[PDB]
């Protein structure tokens, strides 16, 4: 049956938002957060781990996803030291399994996690948030790692260095207890010259090939994939969830075709993904996970400096998907939850 | 088939502004009404417009006139009367003399609502309003006036009285409203029970079931605020408001979730698992029933440092209600075999 616990990304002591406010978003169950104190490629030890933990608890909640242990560029290459990185990988991943959390999830993006023309985008509610100006500036490099990819590593020599990858830290994953969720390359197309594998269903089910685990799996981010409108979102969750190979949502809308993408609210009609039809899914296959917003608009006075991830439209998007599961659970037959213990502190009858 | 998104709006003075309101995924209308008329007096034109002008301008739509304010002078029984209902004559008429379609209000002794508490800690660390029994067991309630109209209901006006004065106000400017357009929306009492020695006629099932009648037509009809009622347990919010649909006499929906018990009551977040009413069953009669009017997320906690002081109007959680409802009923849209529909038009500029 589905356990699926809502959840919001915090990032730690540092964030313009804190865990308080996060904790009243009714329904808010997890926390998606990582630690930011050590260099990527190098290992996360047990005592960064525990005192998020430790925060997070706290504020009661929980950590849900570890929200990325960075995948360094040497990996990525290839590059012949790439095992001393990956072992470093091995000890985050277990320490992770260390700290009782049932999820990491990473990237395979060489250089750019993500593109974005416009970071203040209107829109027409009023709003400003991210697009992708396919034309503006794009197509232009961004002023080594860089001309090696545009050169040397094509697509299948980045392909078996991720196979090499993965094959070697699953059976390390399997012992931790740990769940691994392959965030797809955003936007889902090679850009500036680099490769991008990660683009939609074949990749997947070669992906989900390469290790046949479900503690080797996908984040299904669904705003990703579909910012390509080459790929389709409710098929692709279909697929995935088919073979039990989904390990994290992320549930964020954009709207898109043969021009580019810009962000947009999460309401599905704001965009193209039917964001009902996508949960709907996650009903009818008792799916088990944690589900964020994952970006908002900024709407009313959101000082939040960086970019996507401030908390008022985020935890907008987060009561529509409260609404979105309750609904659909009850029109299923089922009974949804939100982890809500106590409704009143000191009556009661 | 569609209901309308709505949400209040306190005038000019609101410290929530309108882009703010206009920011809120699927919102579409405004509930609004004047402030510059002393209260038992007329409604210009010209005062609607002015705040009409306000507002279409940012986008919205008056969906409805939340409160012109009868004067207790008119609930009294008092002979005075008809002149305070010749200039609520005035404000029904020149309401509809601006496409407003709906005009909610209500027949309440002495108070518009009642709170023991208006900071009371809920367990995910916010405060909502709550109305504690017991709390308000040690206390005695112009200043001397209020003195005297307090005596005179405990008094001279029994509960049949009420009734009285209520179908005189009611066969006197149900005309007004259907001469007009305006369709007139009656709010149930909060609490939905007596208090103060003081009676309360819109209290349940039965009391609709009496006023209805009271005027049998379409433009006679309620405000379906499933959280007074349900600030009952006897109440049953889910037959209530089905009865109501089939009558076709719910002219506006207020949606706001409550916890209770012989203890009193206390407010919570729009969520059903919250507290003590299954909104998804709210909705979902909402659209087996085809209701054409709209719907306000009323009331929310006071989450994340708002500064609002009022009731329950800060921008946030009544705004995280909104999306909740924009999720439930989309959602139960589609199973249904309807398509939803909000505020969307052009999803990029
Ligand atoms: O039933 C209630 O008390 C609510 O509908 C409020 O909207 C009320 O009318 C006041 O405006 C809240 O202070
Ligand atoms: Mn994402
Ligand atoms: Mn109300």
Not at 63 to 89: C, F, M, W
Not at 126 to 148: C, H, M, Q, R, Y
Not at 203 to 217: M, Q
Not at 251 to 256: I, K, L, P, Y
Request: charged fraction near 25%; include cysteine; proline fraction near 6%.
């Amino acid at each position: 049956g589905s356990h699926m616990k809502m959840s919001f990304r915090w990032y730690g002591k540092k964030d313009p938002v804190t865990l308080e406010e996060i904790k009243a978003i009714p329904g808010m169950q997890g926390i998606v957060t990582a630690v930011y104190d050590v260099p990527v490629g190098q290992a996360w030890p047990l005592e960064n781990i525990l005192e998020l933990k430790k925060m997070v608890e706290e504020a009661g909640l929980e950590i849900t996803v570890i929200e990325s242990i960075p995948v360094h560029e040497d990996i990525k290459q290839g590059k012949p030291n790439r095992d001393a990185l990956i072992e470093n990988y091995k000890t985050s991943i277990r320490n992770v399994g260390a700290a009782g959390i049932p999820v990491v999830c990473y990237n395979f993006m060489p250089v750019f996690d993500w593109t974005r023309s416009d970071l203040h985008h209107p829109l027409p509610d009023g709003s400003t948030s991210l697009a992708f100006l396919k034309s503006d500036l794009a197509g232009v490099d961004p002023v080594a790692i860089i001309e090696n990819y545009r050169q040397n590593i094509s697509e299948e020599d980045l392909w078996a260095n991720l196979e090499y990858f993965i094959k070697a830290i699953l059976p390390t994953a399997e012992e931790a207890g740990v769940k691994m969720a392959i965030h797809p390359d955003d936007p889902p197309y090679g850009i500036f010259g680099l490769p991008r594998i990660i683009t939609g269903q074949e990749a997947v089910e070669r992906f989900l090939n390469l290790y046949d685990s479900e503690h080797n799996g996908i984040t299904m981010c669904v705003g990703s994939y579909a910012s390509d409108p080459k790929n389709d979102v409710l098929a692709m969750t279909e697929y995935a969830l088919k073979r039990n190979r989904i390990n994290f949502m992320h549930t964020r809308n954009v709207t898109a075709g043969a021009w580019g993408f810009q962000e947009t609210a999460h309401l599905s009609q704001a965009g193209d993904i039917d964001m009902n039809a996508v949960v709907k899914l996650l009903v009818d296959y008792d799916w088990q996970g944690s589900l964020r917003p994952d970006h908002g608009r900024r709407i009313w006075g959101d000082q939040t400096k960086t970019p996507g991830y401030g908390l008022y439209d985020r935890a907008l998007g987060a009561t529509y998907f409260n609404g979105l599961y309750e609904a659909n659970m009850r029109a299923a037959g089922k009974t949804p939850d939100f982890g809500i213990k106590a409704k009143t502190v000191g009556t009661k009858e």
